[PDB]
Write a protein that binds this DNA or RNA. Structure first.
Lengths: 101, 82, 62, 97, 101, 86, 97, 62
DNA sequence: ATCAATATCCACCTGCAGATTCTACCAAAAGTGTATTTGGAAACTGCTCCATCAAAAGGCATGTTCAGCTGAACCAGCTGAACATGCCTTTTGAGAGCAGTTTCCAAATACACTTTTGGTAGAATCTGCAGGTGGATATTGAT
DNA sequence: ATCAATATCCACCTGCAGATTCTACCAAAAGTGTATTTGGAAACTGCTCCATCAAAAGGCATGTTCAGCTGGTTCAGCTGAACATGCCTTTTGATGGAGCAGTTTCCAAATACACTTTTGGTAGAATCTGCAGGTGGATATTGAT
């Protein structure tokens, strides 16, 4: 070949969309998440221990929350006639759903 | 080296999450914001969980504590008992 | 019942949670009842917003 | 030999699944999901029935309270079919004591 | 002055804003709202009567809900670099709040 | 005569009232199309609420809808209301 | 002459208001609002405390459970101040019977 | 306490609902606790977004 | 910019519609005493959890590269705000239904004891499915 | 249109972790009988809902005027998806041994329940004043010029 084969922008991203939409495995790595949780809980109470299933539960809850947010965010972005998401989109969605924080 | 440990949640994992949301294009500034956002959610959950844990005068955190703390934020969870 | 229909549709004989999520979200009424529930290992529905897809003007144009 | 006892709704789910689709199995995780689901609906309905009874200063829960709660919580046609099933169940039970 | 006095576009609305935000009186007239309530109740059960306070309570709830909706609407509008609200904004707001239609 | 006041129905909820409500929401400039959609939205909300109220009414075997039923119906939809009893 | 008796929390609120801002009154409607507010908070706390009791197989609801519920519902410094008031109050109660 | 302060701002000696709404919405924590509550006859805050206000460069222009 | 128009802010006065305060009582708070529970001290076990190692392997960090996207300028046109007005819709005031109590009871339903008894823990087998193996398509982009 | 490159679906097919079957028990469901508690069908009382017709006050359906917003176009940057490459944080997979989840004993600390005795919280009848409303006038604000 004279040049390397190289997909155009969007195609491979869309391929990844369909792949991850077809499967269900968790996307966050186990160990870093474990260490994060342990550090925060340590900040609240010391020398705690964690069942594996509680960590898994937090994992599932976080990923579900994130995907829900990004979905509504994407709608907000499309509303402004763009395709690239930006922080103010997230802030808008989070302000409307009442998770103001 | 560790970077306050939130950085274990790498960029491409967040990118995969966004992909599952049906998003095509992501700006480079999202990632940092997302981290902060995530932290808040987790903090709230764990506080509630630990509080339940503290009431039983236990030192081991159980899944059920998390399930209840999620239930109270209106994000009820199925599939981990009770 | 709905899950088993989806199972036969995917040529699998044993039920797993993905089938349940597919069954729930595809019915309007159950979606209203379970709009704020997360099924573990459930994933999401296939859905791409129409406007983000590339144009169908991809063929001989010369 | 000291050992525990954990209750669940596994067997009943299994019966129903064999009744509607005899030649098909289901994994344990999905059974867990169904268990959580059943418990959640049980909690919701009982809570609503309680609130109704308290607002009218009646100390008893009857099928009527459950029925009202169902029509409030569940939407439309699903509520109708469920009400019909429950009504048939009560009428057969009271007939065949 | 030969010319009748005339305010520039975008001032009497502001005057309305300050007047209605300083006060708390209900904006909608009672009768058509009352007739609407009775008409809608007829399609579920017949020969119902309504206490006045119940209708007043409903009116308050409706106005608060719509007021909140217009706030969220205007934010959704401002995100699109407009000042004029339109239906697609409303549809977006209701999609994000998690309601049905 | 066909008067049927603007429909003998919701269309008596005139434009300037909606305008006033939009003014309370901080809005400055409104399109003509908002009005109809708003009415539809309002209708939907009312329907659900009234249904629940009437259901409570049906449980106590009454033909007069009380304030308390409405308050509870508003509570179940996450729109708790203060100032009309309980 | 059937003469009813509808209870409320009005008078206590009025006392507190005269304690904190002596030269000020308050209409009836606002008092009704505050009454509904108190009722709401009471219901939330009691429900939460009940669930806490059931999860740990305890049949007594105690001050500890109330404390836990308050730490859950309320944010930060408000929780701390409320807890401090409660602890002071229970400490005074336990001694000076 | 908060309501009484708002009352003194309007030179009224008697607390009315408007004052309560102002008290709740201007304190962050109570607003979180009562985020999904409507105060009857309460109204809202005068908050108008800066963008929809006229141009502050409306000055000496010849 | 300066001056006219004109709404808004703000002083001063009166009375009456809601606020506040007095009074005779009955549902409710509280003190005894007992019985009846119940949750924390004490004492133990055994499953599951926290700190280590070793051989890969698959994912992250970093560094190039270019197609395709996000504002900024500008503007034809449309479309929705500001006023005259008249005109017409909305406010106000002159007996029986039904919510709210009360009797009081035929019916409903908790609770003590036994007798079963299907449900569950746990050992002992099935087999559909996570992998693999390989071939045939189906998108995609270059040209 | 055509044809090479990569990614994706589909026939054969095998050993096993998870699924199902099977024993053997005993902690939950029913029966019998009883003691206790209720929701709902008759009387009765006092608010307050049904929604007409004159007379009058003030809001809207219509039409009219024009400035300033929408939303289309063109385009100069710019920035973020694809990708190769290395290498290095994690994956499986074992092994230990400390200690918390959880269990059992049992009785000292905390509460229902049943009675009696104060008492203050709540209707209802007499008094108050802050604010609605009115009156009037100085200053702030829009805008022509």
């Amino acid at each position: 070949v004279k040049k390397p084969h190289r997909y155009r922008p969007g195609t491979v991203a869309l391929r990844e969309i369909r792949r991850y939409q077809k499967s269900t495995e968790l996307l966050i790595r186990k160990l870093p998440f474990q260490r994060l949780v342990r550090e925060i809980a340590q900040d609240f109470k010391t020398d705690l221990r964690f069942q594996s299933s509680a960590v898994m539960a937090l994992q599932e809850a976080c990923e579900a929350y994130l995907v829900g947010l990004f979905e509504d965010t994407n709608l907000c972005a499309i509303h402004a006639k763009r395709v690239t998401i930006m922080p103010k989109d997230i802030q808008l969605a989070r302000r409307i759903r009442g998770e103001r924080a | 080296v560790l970077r306050d440990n939130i950085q274990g949640i790498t960029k491409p994992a967040i990118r995969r999450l966004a992909r599952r949301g049906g998003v095509k294009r992501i700006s480079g500034l999202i990632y940092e914001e997302t981290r902060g956002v995530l932290k808040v959610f987790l903090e709230n959950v764990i506080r509630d969980a630990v509080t339940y844990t503290e009431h039983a005068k236990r030192k081991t955190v159980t899944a059920m504590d998390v399930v209840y703390a999620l239930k109270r934020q209106g994000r009820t969870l199925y599939g981990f008992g009770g | 019942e709905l899950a088993g229909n989806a199972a036969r549709d995917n040529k699998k004989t044993r039920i797993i949670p993905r089938h349940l999520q597919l069954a729930i979200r595809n019915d309007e009424e159950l979606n209203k009842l379970l709009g704020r529930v997360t099924i573990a290992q459930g994933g999401v529905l296939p859905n791409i917003q129409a406007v983000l897809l590339p144009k169908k003007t991809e063929s001989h144009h010369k | 030999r000291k050992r525990s006892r954990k209750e669940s709704y596994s067997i009943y789910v299994y019966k129903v699944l064999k009744q509607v689709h005899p030649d098909t199995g289901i994994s344990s995780k999905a059974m867990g999901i169904m268990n959580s689901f059943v418990n959640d609906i049980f909690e919701r309905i009982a809570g609503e029935a309680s609130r109704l009874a308290h607002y009218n200063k009646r100390s008893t829960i009857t099928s009527r309270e459950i029925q009202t709660a169902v029509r409030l919580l569940l939407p439309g046609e699903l509520a109708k079919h469920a009400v019909s099933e429950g009504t048939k169940a009560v009428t057969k039970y009271t007939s065949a004591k």
